[PDB]
Amino acid sequence: TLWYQTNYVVPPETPGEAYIIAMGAAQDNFTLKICKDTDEVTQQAVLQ
């Protein structure tokens, strides 16, 4: 969870909204286990 610590303080003649890009990854000690069919494919028709 990300919280406003103090504020988004803006000078005059500047837009008073912005954006943050949240980028994620894995640290060096990332290790994985047995294989698994993913969930993001549900092919219905055979590709013709």
Partner: protein, 246 residues
């Protein structure tokens, strides 16, 4: 190369990029109680991770006619955190704090802030009456405000009859909105006794005074807050007993 700063205590990890220069109160790091001076014959406890975290107090908004705020230590932490549940269960206590206060503002704003710790920061009844049995006195919630932190009534004398102009004898660091948005202090255990109670004797205070008033040309952020993040180091606890709220 000096403006960045990385302080990490416990599972926390604070960073400030614009503020610079840690000031250490009186040139002595916080250390444990030495063997040759302690009196509590029982073994004291050293959690060192659960309690030594950067607990963040509440945000106090800065207005153009603001007066000041203040807190008391370790009074601000007795209801929250494992340190709260550790101080309610122990008669004796010793720790050294790593104060850290933040006030973010734009490069078009102006203002300054006096941040200083005040050892044994007593307060003073605000009244001309000198009748001993009818003497004005500060209330409990006024002198022990808790996690929130009360405000001043006349900051020029610190609500104690001591002028603010001389208030830099104490360890301090200025927040000034042109060069630094943050400040920090590492203070040791300052007490004439090796240990003390935690819910009776506050070791020191903290003041955040708007010396120079926040002034901005209209058309910008009007609500400037102030947050203080606090972190005890080398804490101690002894004399276990039942709970005690106050």
């Amino acid at each position: 190369s000096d403006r960045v700063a990385q302080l990490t205590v416990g599972n926390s990890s604070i960073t400030t990029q614009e503020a610079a220069n840690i000031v250490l109160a009186y040139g002595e790091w916080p250390e444990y109680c030495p063997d040759t001076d302690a009196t509590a014959v029982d073994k004291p406890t050293r959690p060192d991770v659960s309690v030594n975290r950067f607990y963040t107090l509440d945000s106090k908004m800065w207005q153009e006619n603001s007066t000041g705020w203040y807190w008391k230590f370790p009074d601000v932490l007795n209801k929250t955190g494992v340190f709260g549940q550790n101080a309610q269960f122990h008669y004796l206590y010793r720790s050294g704090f790593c104060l850290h206060v933040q006030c973010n503002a734009s490069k078009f704003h102006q203002g300054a802030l006096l941040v200083a710790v005040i050892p044994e920061f007593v307060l003073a009844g605000r009244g001309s009456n000198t009748k001993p049995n009818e003497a004005p006195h500060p209330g409990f919630n006024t002198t022990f405000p808790g996690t929130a932190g009360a405000s001043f009534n006349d900051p020029y004398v610190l609500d104690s009859g001591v002028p603010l102009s001389q208030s830099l004898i104490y360890p301090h660091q200025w927040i000034n909105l042109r060069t630094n948005n943050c400040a920090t202090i590492i203070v040791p255990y300052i007490n004439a006794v090796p240990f003390d109670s935690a819910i009776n004797h506050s070791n020191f205070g903290l003041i955040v005074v708007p010396v120079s008033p926040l002034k901005y040309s209209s058309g910008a952020t009007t609500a400037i807050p102030i947050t203080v993040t606090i972190a005890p180091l080398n804490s101690e606890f002894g004399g276990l007993r039942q709970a005690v709220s106050q």
